[model samples]
Target: KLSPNPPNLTKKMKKIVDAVIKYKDSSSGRQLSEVFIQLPSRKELPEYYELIRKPVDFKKIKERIRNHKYRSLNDLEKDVMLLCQNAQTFNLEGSLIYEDSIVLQSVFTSVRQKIE
Candidate 1:
């Protein structure tokens, strides 16, 4: 293991006391927390090209969330959500694989509770 330094890039991810998004999932790894770290898709670019513009990935956001608090994720998610305004965007694979944005909503819903 590499030093459990508890790297919280934020000022005090320890005690800001803003919101506790999906605390249960974070408590239970492999839940929403599992996928939350992985950014959005690169697959879409291969599929749509110009139809889509920005890729609001959590990888970029992974660190961003650490410091970039209070509706940062929500705003970014909304942009990604509408950008895929192709909610026509299946929100999937394998013969019309659909039913997602699970990541979107999972995290988004978490943020949404604060100021939806």
Candidate 2:
């Protein structure tokens, strides 16, 4: 079993380490968000870890899509189409779990920006 605390130590610089640490002894409540929404696994680390990091160009995305002036049902459908390409990442877990930065970046960059 993993220890809940990361590591206990004292620093000489009088610095405060504001951060999140996950260990077997830790509670699931402290996690940023549910890992996989459909298959929510409480036993895996990578699953939840992915949810914690999102690096994307949200501003560019908003700017590009905003000019569409989408004001009707058909316009919403077009936006959904742009986001549908993201669905494949769920089945590509092997690619991500193995430290495939490319795969992980692709997943986050595509879907994360669309959230806001």
Q: Which model scores highest in lDDT?
A: 1
Any runs in candidate 1 off by more than 4 Å, and if so which? 1-45, 66-97, 102-107, 110-116
Candidate 1 clashing pairs? 82-85, 86-89, 91-101
* Stretch of 10 with least lDDT, candidate 1: 13-22
Clashing residue pairs in all predictions, respectively, total 3, 0
Per residue, candidate 1 scores C-alpha lDDT tens digits across 10-30 of 333322222322333444343
Residue 39 in candidate 2, Cα distance off native in Å: 25
Report how far residue 81 has shifted in candidate 2, in Å: 3.3
Candidate 1: what lDDT? 0.39
Report the C-alpha displacement of residue 30, candidate 1, in angstroms: 6.8
TM-score against native, each model = 0.37, 0.22
Q: List model 2 lDDT by residue over 1-116, tens digit each.
A: 32222122122000111111111113334222112113333464366437433312223233323433333323433433333223333336454322232333343434434432
- Model 2's lDDT to the true fold? 0.29
